[PDB]
Amino acid sequence: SDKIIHLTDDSFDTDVLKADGAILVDFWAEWCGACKMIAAILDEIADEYQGKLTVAKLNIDQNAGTAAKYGIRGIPTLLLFKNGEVAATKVGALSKGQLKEFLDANL
Numbered sequence: 629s630d631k632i633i634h635l636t637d638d639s640f641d642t643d644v645l646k647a648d649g650a651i652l653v654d655f656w657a658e659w660c661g662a663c664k665m666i667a668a669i670l671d672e673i674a675d676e677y678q679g680k681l682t683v684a685k686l687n688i689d690q691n692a693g694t695a696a697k698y699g700i701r702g703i704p705t706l707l708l709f710k711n712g713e714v715a716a717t718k719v720g721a722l723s724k725g726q727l728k729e730f731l732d733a734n735l
């Protein structure tokens with residue numbers, strides 16, 4: 629958790645939309661096994677991709693407005709942002725290797 633930004637409705641524009649470089653945002657909530665599945669995977673990816681990628685989480689129960697703005701329809705959903713825009717979407721739990729494949733394809 630040392631390299632993961634916790635985003636909110638109030639920080640999203642500064643932390644994500646105005647940020648430099650690609651930002652991977654995990655839309656998640658409690659009572660979601662698949663969300664838990666990717667939590668440790670995200671710490672690993674944040675470390676291995678440091679300097680090329682920023683990793684962040686947005687809890688959709690705590691920040692419903694932002695979840696609605698990006699049309700979250702299931703959790704977890706990973707949105708990859710570049711320059712304030714959604715570059716790519718990955719729905720559901722996946723392995724570390726699968727997440728690396730998604731990132732490498734879109735970076």
Ligand SMILES: [Cu+2]
Pocket residue numbers: 629630631632671
């Ligand atoms: Cu950490």
Ligand code: NA
Pocket residue numbers: 717718719
């Ligand atoms: Na998908």
